[PDB]
Each structure stands twice: as structure tokens, then as C-alpha cells.
Symmetry: none
Subunit: 320 residues, 6 copies
């Protein structure tokens, strides 16, 4: 499992973004108590203590805590960083009132196997009211995707599997969100913002959302589904522009890549054609650590065969 | 709206079915043995989508009992009805230890039981439970023979950058990671031209006679270098052989670097020493494998080696060492 | 006969410019002369002769494109100097039985495949003035070890399951199929050797059914899956002048003839220094003279470490058609 | 040769359509007799026999029947499938009466080197009147194509070739039908149907057709000629939707690709402009396997620059 | 020893060899000059084809080599050579009929002997005399290079823990000489200027040129790729030998000169970039070039006005 | 950035200074550090970062102006003082330094090596038993197999597109070539030529002469000697010293190695020996250039009996 840590540490956009945020707020860190929710190898705890901090408490329920203790001694921070192995709820913090909370909580569709719940638990139970959260703002976005070649190959396969008809797998494949990096040139509609979350104020009840969206076709192509992603923003001192980053196709590689959702219809689009729709995202009733996604869309066109191209449909996707 | 009542991660079954070497080797074996399948009861241990159960029913069999502990059994039920086999195939959801079989005696047992270093998250254990409790004595097991092998690998370019990353992570010294990475067995496809020693066979298991105690094995091996190269560790793999009628050649396949692609790929185990070899030099050694104490599902591997050479530099290049690795 | 084939031969800059720059080097041998173009097609070589000085050029070809050639020679200012005849040279009434120079683009895919060599020999035998010049005059077949494991395992394993059925009997058939394709330099992993050379001034039809030996030695560790074959071409020349020559091999620029690959039945595991010694025979067959029976026999020998386990001896019969 | 067999078997649209159609009709197959005209490797015969048939008789005039006999032995259908080497007309069929006839008779522009003829001989001579043909309905279609960049390379190359004027090649190229797959986005007009054939009624004389078409422009582009194709339709039980497939550009790849014909004029077109005209198709006198195709058209522009872009022309083409 | 890279460049070496051969009958009883002699081949290839006598100029220990070479291959009596800048140096001859020169560099004009070849036609050439080559031109088109610029500019964010960000504008202003693969070209290629050596007066080399590129497909235009095309002389009516150093032509040691824009432009098929590139050799060092690019990128498509952008970039070839 | 992007991306070099400095962080702690040839300021920054009362970064390139900007950003302005120009001219805020850290090493160790400036600093500014980073270094050579590449740049001048251009081949055969000599292409017993200790060495000792013996590993052509250097750092009592090699047998450093091609492409056999002499001195025409000369004798005692046992001299100019 060191692999997810080599993968997370080698994502320079992620780690440098936390680094640069902590440096921009170094004097806000200066003599404060820091909580690292989901510390991993302790890299963000070592940045906090590196840029001045009275003490950082880093927590995580994984074995890598024992490694991170070795790392925190090797780099001379053993006095300033305490690492606790466990889930935040099961752990007694040595200073119950924390000034800053830093956490790399985000998951694949922002909310997929995210630690957001544990971070809002942390702010609600240990943060000093006007306390700083790193990052504190985020948003989910989408746009139309061209993926004809791959999607037809993925769905054609099940027509004959060694002679047996495997057609019942085709709807199963359409119901599955794919996490993959999309080539920018394949994004073929304008992008829209679904929802936004302010971690200073948001309650867990607001994570189950429902949103409206409209995408306008940028060029003549097929829209086989949507590609979604998220953007991140960090706190900043008065006046300064904040450190931010994006996980979308129009931005550099991030280990979060993008999450693709395939539509049931392959839409035939001309420039200016329009997809208006709605996406709902809710934790599943049977299992809250899985996500029920539903996408409804109205592909309205008009040009010569406009009505023979116009399509309205919906899809339900399950993420797990 | 569509209600989500099912686990199915389609991707992992697509990976299994698109492995042509794996699935065509079970198909070809069943075809070679179709007459021996004709009025028999077949048990599919770990049926997944039911594909091998369907191969069996297609090739004449009184009945197939497909067993698996994953939600894919309800989809697999759908595939059995669509291909006309609902009356001949019975699928059960659960672990074989628990479920209560419809037919007290199985004549043939088919299973894709193999894990990454043959034995890593394998269901060998459950196949042996099945022949011991349900098979008719001289009954056929598909596959029934397997064997683990190794040889020296040249990986200097990738090993060096994996290890050199940890010397400075954004300013911090991350050197303690280096021993952790050197002892994580990697599952990857090795390029055949990077294999630079002769191969050796560590162990063989005949599933018709093997008891669970033997899966924890200790074995010695010797490797001679084919060409002048750095040997950075070993590449390991396994070969499978299927039962065969009197006089036909048995169906077989290898997951080693010298064979076509397979999803089990190979397991690489890195040495602490990067060895400077010359044509003719040697690695004599020992590999021991055992499920461990604090978790019998994870594999403790130990590899001991002694690399020796005679070409002038001979003693300056020779070296011995030991290592423990864990697959999890 | 379709523009395509003719656009192809004309876009192969190596082929046509090699005949151009060769005829230019011999223009002083040309100035007074009469020349015969075997298989002239769009008349390009004939017009090259005329353009560089010649009393006449008689161009022959059995395909409809001959008609198109006639407009072209009218259009390019050569109508008086170039005479064109449609049909088979053998029986189509040659209007000048004493030719000084004869040019032809006779070459086929493994040099001899659907090759006009038999018709070019008939023309020197029947119309050339003894020490008369042929373009080109010398050709030679060559071969080397090829690495192509990825594509070959895909092509053959496809036949194991065809929509549920077993199409395994198709694997021996693909394996005896010589494929024409361009081989990237880097997949050539042995030395190259010469099989057979031909001197067009001297060669008789009899010799075109040949038998020859070759030794390839491995340049690096690799799997050798078969041989990649090709030909080199040379043009006649005046003394003091080095001949214009071209190769159709993987180590030379693209030519429409590409290379002709033959797959072995064994995939040879080789170490640097190892060797393949073999024999290739070639004979045009009874049931269709234009089709070729090729047979390759080899002994892959190795002295390195595992030697005899790796070393292979085997035979393979291939059919070009 | 092996090649066209690899190309026909690897075409999943083709084979799977015959597969699916036979499965839909499997009850009407059940205990009957079927003839496979042009059976090649025997794949269709094997589908029929696999889905229930007292007998499949497979005919073909190619050396491949000695191979297909081995494939039927290897695949366990030897008592039910009987293969015969030769041109249908004179071969001695084990059965006088056939219940079902399946064949893969189609050629590049449907009718190009087609064995349709032989299939009609087989229904008129051996089919039980209301007997089923697979497939029994097919149709040729067309639309305007944008090919400017490639066509100008192919017609301008002929000017200066090594110093020689090769211009007379230009009309020769411009009247060469090309078989190539066209990308969806280069089809710039509405599509129209030329002709339709019902294989149960069609007499040979009807293949020498002459028909009209109207093509309305979908967007601003150069129309350099027409892309043509064909659609196939399989017989079905009443209540069941027929298995069908298309070989056109807005349908997945198939080995028949499309057959492009180039126009003598490169038409300049705005959204809404129109190509009206005619296509005539007839076998040639000296060799009836060759096809004389002529296309006549009038492009009238109703898009602002009307008269300057309006063009009328004719072109004869030959398939051989 | 660098001169290997010069003579090993076949599209340079052979292009001159075949270009001299096409004009052989016009070299005949005449006299030639190998200005900027990069070892002697142009004087050696020239002499060997009729031209009664040649003269060679190179300011480096390499002409001591050229003199020896002329003897190992016979030539000595027909070929005369020297150490020095042709501006004021003298070998045994007064005038010349054809000047043969391997003068150009990188942005056609950077470490080039162009002024020195202009010196020779203005002082020793017989008015209607032959210059090899006589015509040249610089071109540009737009480029997709997103991953390499994003990684090249990301390195400086973390050097062994320290922030090295002041290096980013510096490398953005570094015009890179490399081979662009043709598929990364994403616009129509334009012509900035064209020179003719038989007429081009020295001052003319400090040019200010306007260009226009239209986008050929959707992409990120990250900057410009520049290159040049060479054309040689020929007898009345026949094909001039000619070659190019551009992305869609076979490899050349001059490669292409990439200039990165300050903005990574998002373009759709048909979007336009209108600019002006100026090139002035600078005051402190007349072998170092000041390159400045002004550009206006417009779009009439779907979100056209937001993506449209104009800017300036100063660059320094040094 | 050119030369700086390469220097800083050299992980073996930079990391050897980092790890040697962290090993020694107690001895830096409240001390005064002279950084000879600081460049971007990265080693000065390593010093300040690991406890230093002050660092004086000196260098004569425009790059000092950047080093001041980088010294600000990372938090070191108060601890790092940067001086533009040469040491002897520009003068230091502190009279005496406790530690001198410098990346002085050139291509054949001594090529445009700042050895002389570093020694000027321990002789004029370092406190007697003061620490020098690095403090020990050694030049080394081995036998090379470079057949293909050498025969490329040789035979090509025989028929340079028709002409005989070969008086080049002796020139090319004597201008030393800097390149990463592939590990597998080395075929003799790597011998120690000479070493220097920066605490004790005085400029005069750099014009050397040395003793070498090379036992051949295999039967192959010993085309030239490939030569390289190893570095070692000052270390505390009982600690393993930080060290590294530019050797072909070691990872890529920016210095790679300097190849010396032989006139005679020696055909060797497992067991036979080259013995001889190497002399290295600076030049009168220019005190920065290096005059190298190689005296080799090949005793081919083996498969040839005594037949290809040749002996030859070599004069090479590094420029």
C-alpha cells in the first residue's frame, strides 16, 4: 500500500498546491495547533511544522503511521508532530482545541471515497470557530465528452464472448462511472458548474445534492456522455490571490483524473446544439460509502435533421 | 429509475474473460475431454460469470454446479438463462464450506483458482476442500497440475528511479521508504529480453494428491547467467497443465515472460544487491513461502541467495544476502 | 487497369528517379540509339529515354493503360519518337527487331513474384544487339532475421475462437503465408546475407527456379520469428562512372515493393552471436506458373549457456499467390 | 487465399447480424433444411446447425470447402452439414426442396461483385415458395461528401511529374469509384434512398436500375461528391422487430466500407442548399461482372450566393 | 569536434552537391568562392566539376585541415585556402564568377555568415554571378506543446525543497531550437519574409514582418514554430534543386526554432492568429538576436470572445 | 537557465552535498560558511537550512542577482550574504570562515575546475582545522570498448560523400571525448591514478604523472582508456563519509566521463595487461586548458602468445 502514497506524493499539482497554501499562510501557522486529518506519510504535517506551528496532530487509520513516525524523527520534527493511528472519532487528541485543520480529503467525484465527513466532524468538534481549513472551498463541474471509439469497443465486446451471448452486460457497463483522464480535444461542449461547497459552513446534509446544468456544443461531434471533475480553493491572508487547483481535462494531470458517465443515447451534435439536464448525487441508502448518481438530459437541436437528432433520456449510475 | 441491487464491478470480469490464454486454455481442455464430460456432474468452484460452467454444459454434461461468493451469480444466472442452459446449470451464491450442494457427488471439478504468485489470493484451498469432500476418488480436476518458476531479471533503469525518488520528497528526506519498496513484490509483465538467466523450477503441485500443509514450501534453486548484465532480483511465474485422455497431448499454458500475455503477469522480487554479472556466473539460493501468523490470507516469502563469479574481478563481484518479502 | 497501381509506381520516388538518374548517366550511350521498354505502363521510362536523346523508343504493355500513354506522349512532345504497342510482347509484332538498349520495370514483390523477368529475357534473346544494355542489368535477393513476436502471436491466436467455433486449422495456413509489409529497421535482429544474384545479360529462365543457402548471425538478444526478405537492384554504366543502384530492404528508404516476410514454425530464442544456417529454394509451380513455391529449411544453432535446449532445426513450405 | 475470410469473420457487424437473426428465428429453423449459398469457411452453416436444423447444405466454387469440411468435423456438426464444391447451378444438392436460404452475397456497392444472382437462382429453383431468405431486404443510399483536402492531392499530383505533364490522368482519376470508410463528420448533407430490393420478389432484370435523389445541405462546406452505401434487413417473426444493419458512415465499421464517387465540380455550399439528380446503374456489355454507373446532378443554391455557386453536371463511372 | 554534424547533414551536403552538378556547364571555364568554408567540400565539390579554379574562406583551425584535404584527394593546383574573416583577408585572386556558401543559421539569420556572403557578392562577384544558394525564406506556424512546457515550467516549483519560480519567465523567453514532429503543427503555415541573395542589401536583414495563421483542428496553441526554405539557381526552364528545414520535411541540423507564447491559447478549427514578429541584431553583440512577437488571437465560435487574446513576447537568441 | 538546469537536476551531485551537510549539521550549527562558486545559491541554502550563523555565497557570474532573489523567497535573506565577483577581489563580511563548501569540480576533475579558488579560500580565510566540502578526491581509469562508434567517426572520413577526408581521423582520435561510457563496454581492472586531499594539497601538485596497470576482463578490443573521478566528504568521528563516483560503473552525473582513444585498437584476451604512464599539465598558450599525454604498453600474454603485444604514446588537448 506504499503505492497509493508514491502516487499521491508524485502528483505534484496536489502536494505543491498544499505546500504553496501553507507557505502563503505561514504567519497564520506560526504558533498554532494543527490537525491533519488523514495524514498518510505525514508530508502535510511536516510542511505545517516546517513553516512554523506550535504542534501538529496527524491522524490516520492506516499502518503507514509507523513509517511516518520514522520520517518525522528523521526530519527533525519528533517534538512538534504527534501522530495518532485510528479513526478521528476513536482518538483522544492531546490538545482538544485545534486552530487549523489541514486534510487531503477529496475522493474521485470529489465526494466518492472521501474524508469530508471526518473533516466536518473535525471542524464541528475541535476547531476554533473562525479557524482555517486547508482546503476550504470546492466545486464539481461537467462537460460533454466525445468517446465513440472506446465506448463502442467496450459495449461491442459482450455481444459474443467465446460463442455465448453476453448482452445483459451492456446496460451494466453504461451504469458504471469510469475514472480515467480525458484528452482535452475530446471535451466538446462548454463546461457548467453543478454545485459548490464551503467547508466552513457546509453540513453533511448538503452533500446529497441535486443540480441543473446546460452545456452548449462547441463543435460538430458525437456526445457520448459527460466528463466531470472538481476544483479546489484554499484559504488566504487578507488581500492575496488564493492558491487553487483543478482536476478537469483542461488542466494538468492529477491522480484524481476525471470521472466519466456514459449516456444511454449517443447524441449527434452540431455546433450550438444544446444539452440541458439535471444531476443528482446522493449516498446510497443500503451503503452510505457508495454513491447513487442520476443524470437526466434533454438534447435539443435544430438544424436540417434537428428533430431526428433531438433526444431526451435519463440514467442511473452507481459508484462503488 | 433503476434501483441498485447489485455489486458488479464489470471491469474485473471483463479482465478475466478477455484473457484469451486463460479462457481458451479451459475451453480447449474441456473440448479435448468432452466425451469424458458427457453424463457427469461438474462443480465450478469460483464460477464468476459462469463461463466455464457454460463451456461444460455446452460440451455435454448432466449438470454443472457453479459456486461463487460474489453478487455476479445473479448476473451469471441471467447469462445461463439467455444461452439456453437454465435447466443444466445450477448456480449457488456463497462459500463452498457453507452452501449445501444439490448433488452429493461431483465427478469433475473445474476451477479458475489461481492467484498472482500461483498461491497469492488463491482459491486452491477451496478446490482441495472440494475434491476431499465431493469428488469421486479418481475424478478429474481442471486444471490438476501447477508449478512455480523463476529466473534473474534486469531492471536497473526502473529500480533505480523507484528508489531514488525517496531521497528527497519536497525537501524532506524519505530514505526509510527504500527498504519498504525493495520488499514489496511487484506484479508486472516483464519484457523477455530483460530475463537474463536460465530458469528454474521451485515446486510442483499435483492437485490430485496435494494436501494443504504442503503449500507452505521451502525450496532451493540455481540460476546461470546467459549474458553480461546487472541482475537486480528475480522474476517469478507459474505453469498450469490440464488432464488428458490416453494418448492426446495435455492442454497447457505458462504465465512466464517467455509466454504470451496473461492477467497474472509475473511477480518480481527485488534483491537488496544489484549483482554485476558476466556470462556463466551463478545465483544459487533458497526461496521459502508460507501463509503467515497474523493473517493466513497474506503470503510471507523469503529469498536467500549467493551470487558467485570467476571472471578476474570474481571475488569483488560476488555476494550473498537474504530477504523477507510480504504479499498483501 | 486502374490509376491507383500506376499512381503508386510513379509516387515511389526511389524507383522512378533511380531509372531517371541511371538513364541520364547513360545519355551519351543513348543519343543515337533505339530502345525497348518492356512493361511500359504510363510510358514514363520511354519518355525518359526520348527526353535524354534517342532515335526511337518502342514501348510495350498488355494493359489498357497503353491508351492513356499515347495521349501522354502526344501531349509531352514525344509523339514522333515514341511508338506504343498494346498486348503481349511475345506475339505483338515488334516494329524494329534490332534494339540497342532495353529498359523494363519488371520487378515483382520477392523480385521474382508476378515478375516480367521472363518477358524481359525473351526480349534480349530476340531483339537485343549482342552487347546491348539492359535497365536494370543486375538484381539480387537478400534476407535477415526478423523480430515480430507481438503481431504474429495476435494474428495466429485470433483463430482459436471465431464466434465460439474452433478455427485452429487456419493457424498452419497463415504461417505458410508470406506477407508483404514494411519492416522497421529495429525489428531486424541478425546480420543480412545474400541468397542469389542475377545478371540479366547472362541469365536463363532455368536459373530462376533456384536453390540457395544463407547464414544469419544474431546481433543482439531477441526472439527470431522468421525472415524478412528483399532485393537490391543495379544499373549498367560507363567506365569511370559508379552505377546507379537501389535496395528495397529494411535498412533502406521506402519503396512500393516493401519487404516480404516469411514466418518460421519455431520462435527462435536467441542470444548475440547465435546463428541461423539455412536453405531457401524457389520454383514457379505447374498448377499456376505465376505463383511461387518457396521452401525454407534451417538449423538455429547456439553455443551459449542453454544451447541445445534452445537450438532448433526445421522445414517450412510457403506459397506466394 | 485466407485474407477475405479474415476480413469477413473479423467484421463483427456482419457476422453477428446473421448470428442474431438466426437466433431470433431459431424456432422457424428447428427441424428444417437450409442452403448456404457462398458459405466460404462455413461459419453461417455452422450457426444454422448450431441453432437447430435437420440439414445444412453449403455450396461455394472455391478451394476453401476442403477446409470448411474439416472445420465442420472439428466443430462437431459433420452429420448435419453437407458441403459441396462448385457453382450452384449444376451441382447435385442432396435435397430437392429447401426451407431456408442464407447467404453472404453482398458486394462493395451492394451490387458490385455480388452473388445475388446465384442466390436468386437458388430461390427460383430450390426454395419452398414462402421460404425464408437471409437476408431478404436491402437498400442502396447516398449523401454528400466533403473530401476537399484529399481529392485536390489526388487531382493536382498529375501536373508536374518529374518534369512531365500527366494531366490526362485527371479525368481517369475523377471517374474512379473509391472504396474507403468515410468519417461521420465529412458527410455534409441529408441522406436519401436510391433503390430497395426485396430478395423474395426481385428478378435479375431489376438490378439494372435508374433512380432519383434530393440532397439538402446540413452545414457550410465544399461538396466534392457523393458517398454511397447499403443497408440490409433480415426476416423476422411477426411481432418481432427485424435484425438489421447498415454499412453507411454514421454506422459502425464494416468491411464493405463506402463507395465514394467524385463530382466533376467542387460544389460550394451553405446550410439548406440542394443537390437534385440521378444515378443509373447497369452491368457492362463485354463483362457483366463490371458496373456502369452514371450520376447526373443539379446543385441549386438558395443560400445568398445562389447563382455563382449553382451548378449542373454529369459523370459516368466504371466499377471493375 | 562539431564539423561532423555539418557534413553528416545530407539534406545540406548532397543538396549542394546536386545543386552544383545541375549548373556544371555554367561552372565550366569560370572561377568560384567557398565563403564560410566549413572544411572544404563546397570548394572541392565545385572544382571537380569543370570550374577552372576555386578559392576558400574560413576563420578557424579547420582551414589548416582544408589545405591538407585538397592534397589527399589531388586537388591542390585547382584549390587555394585561408585562415580568416573574409572582411579583409587575401588569397591569390582578384575576382570571382560563382560564390558557393554554407552560410545560414537557426532562425535562418542567427550565427550566420550571411553578412560575409553579402561582402563577397558586393566586392568580388561578376554582377550577374551565381550564388549557391540564391533564395531563402522564413516561415512559421502554430504549435501544440502543452505537456513538455507544463513539465519544463513545473520543475522550478521544487528544487530539493526550495521554490525556484523566478526561473519560469526566463525559460518562457528562451527560444528553443529543436525538431517539432509535424502532427504538433496546428495552424496554416505562413511566410514572414523571403530573401534573394543577388539583391538583398545588408540593412534588409533587420526585418519587421506581419503574419496570419488559421487554426486547422481544435488544440492548445502554445507558441510558434519557425523554420526556413532554401532554393538554388538553374538554367532556363528546368527544376531548381531545393530543400527545407521545416517540421513536415526530412531532418535538418538546423531543425526549427520554437517560440513559446505567454498565453496557452485554446483554439477551435478556424480561429485566427494575427501577429507581427520583429528581428533586430542587437547593440552589445551583433551575432546575438532580439526577437519580439506581437499577436492577436480571435474567435467567432461558441464562447469566442472569452477565449480570444492578444499579447507580446520579447525573446533573445544568445 | 541551461547549465543551471543541468547542475540542479544532477541528483547524485546535489544530494551528496545535502546528505554530507545533514550528516554534519552539528558542526555547521553556529558557524560561518564560505560557499565558493555558489551559482544559484542551492548549497548556501542547504547550509543556512541546517543551522549556520552565516553563509557567504561568492560567484563571478550574473547569477548572483538571482541567488539574492531565491535567498529571499525561501526565507534566508538574514542568513545568506551573496557577493558578486571573484573571492580575492570581493570581500567578505566576516574575516574568517569555519567551513568552506564548494562545487568546484571540472570534467576530468581538473578541467575548468575551481580547485585553485577553493585552495585560495582555505589558505586565506579558513580557520586551520576548518572543514572543506568535499575534502577528498581521486582520478581513475579503465579500458574501453568503443568499436562501432569509433569506426563510424573513422571510416566516414575515408569517403565523405565521395571524397577522402581522412587527415581528420588523427585529430578526432586526440581531442578527448566527454561521454557516458556504457557500463558493459569497460574491459579492464579499474586502477587508481592519483588522489588529492583538499586540506593539505598545494596548487603545484596538480601537474602529475602516474602509474597504471590494467588486467583485461574479456576477449575484445581495448580501444582507448575511459577515465573518471570519485569524491569523498569530511565526516565526524566514527561516521561513514558521504561519497560519490563519476565512474561508468555508477549513475549518470553531469560530468559523465572523459574517453581517451588509443591509436592502436588493441585486441585483448582475458588475462592480458596494459601497463604505462599518464601525465597531465596545464598550457602556456592558456592556463585553463589541459595538456594530457598517455604512455601505454600492452603485454598480450595469452591466445596470441606474444604477437599483438604493441606499445604506443598519445598527446591529447582538452579544450
Amino acid at each position: 500500500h506504499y503505492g497509493i502514497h508514491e502516487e499521491m506524493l508524485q502528483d505534484t499539482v496536489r502536494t505543491l498546491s498544499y505546500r504553496n497554501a501553507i507557505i502563503q499562510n505561514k504567519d497564520l501557522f506560526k504558533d498554532k495547533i494543527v490537525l491533519d486529518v488523514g495524514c498518510g506519510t505525514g508530508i502535510l504535517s511536516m510542511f505545517a511544522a516546517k513553516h512554523g506551528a506550535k504542534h501538529v496532530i496527524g491522524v490516520d487509520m492506516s499502518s503507514i503511521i509507523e513509517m511516518a513516525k520514522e520520517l518525522v524523527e528523521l526530519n527533525g520534527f519528533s517534538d512538534k508532530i504527534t501522530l495518532l493511528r485510528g479513526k478521528l472519532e476513536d482518538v483522544h487528541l492531546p490538545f482538544p482545541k485545534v486552530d487549523i485543520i489541514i486534510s487531503e480529503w477529496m475522493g474521485y467525484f470529489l465526494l466518492y471515497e472521501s474524508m469530508m465527513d471526518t473533516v466536518l466532524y473535525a471542524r464541528d468538534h475541535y476547531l476554533v470557530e473562525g479557524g482555517l481549513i486547508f482546503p476550504d472551498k470546492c466545486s464539481i463541474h461537467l462537460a460533454g465528452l466525445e468517446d465513440s471509439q472506446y465506448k463502442d469497443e467496450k459495449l461491442n465486446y459482450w455481444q459474443d464472448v467465446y460463442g455465448f451471448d453476453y448482452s445483459p452486460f451492456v446496460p451494466l457497463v453504461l451504469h458504471e462511472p469510469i475514472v480515467d483522464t480525458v484528452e482535452r480535444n475530446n471535451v466538446n461542449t462548454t463546461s457548467d458548474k453543478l454545485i459548490e461547497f464551503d467547508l466552513n459552513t457546509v453540513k453533511i446534509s448538503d452533500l446529497a445534492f441535486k443540480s441543473n446544468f446546460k452545456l452548449t456544443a462547441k463543435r460538430q461531434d458525437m456526445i457520448n456522455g459527460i466528463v466531470t471533475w472538481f476544483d479546489i480553493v484554499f484559504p488566504a491572508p487578507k488581500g492575496k490571490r488564493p492558491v487553487e487547483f483543478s482536476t478537469g481535462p483542461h488542466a494538468p494531470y492529477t491522480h484524481w483524473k476525471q470521472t466519466i458517465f456514459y449516456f444511454p443515447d449517443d447524441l449527434d451534435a452540431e455546433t450550438g446544439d444544446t444539452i440541458e439536464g439535471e444531476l443528482v448525487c446522493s449516498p446510497n441508502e443500503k451503503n452510505n460509502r457508495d454513491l447513487n448518481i442520476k443524470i437526466s438530459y434533454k438534447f435539443e437541436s435544430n438544424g436540417i435533421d434537428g428533430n431526428s437528432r433531438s433526444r431526451k433520456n435519463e440514467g442511473s449510475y452507481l459508484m462503488h
